[PDB]
């Protein structure tokens, strides 16, 4: 079958970035801001946290777009503890 598949033997890149208070301006440039081209395949870890023994699911949110300006649609895939909210809107994306 011929389809949109990853190149076997190529390298995955862990683009997840975790911070506490500060955000680095270098996190919002190349190589983190990557070219989409035909598409991407993602393998995402479900970082299962616990509060008072109650399990919570957390993972990085991905945005896909072009200029990231409110005259262009940006696709956003964001998780909410078991609910994957997917939107494609003319968002005013922040600088960081």
């Amino acid at each position: 079958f011929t389809g949109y598949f990853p190149k076997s033997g190529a390298n995955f890149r862990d683009l997840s970035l975790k911070g506490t208070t500060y955000l680095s301006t270098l996190w919002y440039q190349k190589p983190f801001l990557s070219d989409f081209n035909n598409g991407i395949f993602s393998r995402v870890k479900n970082t299962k946290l616990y509060v008072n023994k109650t399990l919570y699911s957390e993972f990085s949110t991905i945005v896909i777009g072009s200029v990231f300006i409110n005259n262009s649609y940006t696709i956003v895939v964001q998780p909410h503890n078991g609910v994957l909210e997917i939107t494609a809107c003319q968002y005013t994306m922040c600088e960081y």
Binding site: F1, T2, G3, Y4, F5, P6, K7, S8, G9, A10, N11, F12, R13, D14, L15, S16, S34, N37, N38, G39, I40, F41, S42, R43, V44, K45, T47, F59, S60, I62
Partner: protein
């Protein structure tokens, strides 16, 4: 962890089990062994 890799239009040998689940796959142009696997349409080609 959020691992990403680029996609492209590629030919894959997809193996489906008796319940319709893709159990194994081969990227035909990835390596010489993958080319043998796709040529014979088998995960483990015969000795030769």
């Amino acid at each position: 962890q959020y691992w990403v890799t680029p996609l492209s239009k590629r030919q894959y040998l997809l193996k489906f089990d008796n319940r319709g689940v893709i159990t194994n796959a081969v990227d035909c142009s990835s390596s010489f062994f993958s080319e043998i696997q796709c040529k014979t349409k088998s995960l483990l080609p015969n000795t030769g």
